[PDB]
Amino acid sequence: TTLMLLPDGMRRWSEKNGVSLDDGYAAMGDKIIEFMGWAKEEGVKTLYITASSAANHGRPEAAVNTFMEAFTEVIRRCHSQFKFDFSGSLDLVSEDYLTELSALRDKSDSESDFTLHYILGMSLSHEVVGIFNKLNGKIPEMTEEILAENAYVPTQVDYIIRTGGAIRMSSFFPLMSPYAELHFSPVLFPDTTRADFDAALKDLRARDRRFGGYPA
């Protein structure tokens, strides 16, 4: 049901195709619209996309505006097709983009059966530092339920696809989904095809999932 995409490889794809980072991120933008179609058509109801980690916001200003603009451009183009929301380390993101993203959330089809949600500035340590400071001395006790209701990723994630040929989480691990299944693809994200997508879903659906228990 619930899929999280970690779209990676834009810088390398740009260099390999002799185009600008901006063109790489536009290719990403277009590929994200394709991908979502595939997802909807495969029974995904909620698609999280990790727009950025915390450390990604430490890249040069131009590289940062480039990913922000391209991710935002997807929402300007497709917002009436889905329910849109965003979350994360929003202190790391510029005011302009939060405004625009806020509006697009406003402008999106609150009634859709498909959700597309961005995490921005993703990072367990940032997430936990922020939650602690928001609730320190204001609640008697943290619980699982309070933590879930404050986590960046507000629901459980079943499947994670990460492109870009790197077998690591890169700060994108979902706090409350310990048993999320991971599919790593060596493909640079803008090269991703439907065959790639179907081979990922075929691997992910064949997994025997045990959630820390023994099959009885």
Added chain:
Amino acid sequence: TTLMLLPDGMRRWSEKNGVSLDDGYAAMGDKIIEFMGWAKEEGVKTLYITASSAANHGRPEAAVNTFMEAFTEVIRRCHSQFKFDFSGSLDLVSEDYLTELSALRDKSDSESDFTLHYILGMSLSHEVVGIFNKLNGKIPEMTEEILAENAYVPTQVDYIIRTGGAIRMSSFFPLMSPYAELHFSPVLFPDTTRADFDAALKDLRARDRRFGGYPA
């Protein structure tokens, strides 16, 4: 340098060899003892071992006592050769084991250049719940530094090996190590050979690490 092992596949191993889960977990212990030896030869100084997740303690009580006894037994036999420590969701673990493991921590070699550290009850949600509640109202603010000194895994993790065929974290993601490299082996943990460990180490040492940044 800093390695975390997720030893998985003992119930499948036992089924394969038609033995009891006890015998499977005993073969695990023996294999842990070998693996530590390999790790030391290859320059590992701190070896973390995920003895259990939170949900693992939800297995039937006989299954729980088998993993707990087997992990404890490694330490009984080998505690004089390394510095031993343990952390995690210790409220989940039976008192008898906690007392014994603390006594073995005391008998272990405080001067060793090699640290073997068990995480018990590992789970990011349990972890963050426990940090919040221990510190709620007792510090002015949470910082990254303060979180790292309270996390289940008290240092940065470079590499993670996970055996058992499953390409997932299974509640074992290290809170403060977002860029830890992941190597997944299909081998059931008790069949692990030196050649498997060497290919894991070769793969992990060849990784091109970016920590969320771009190269200058």
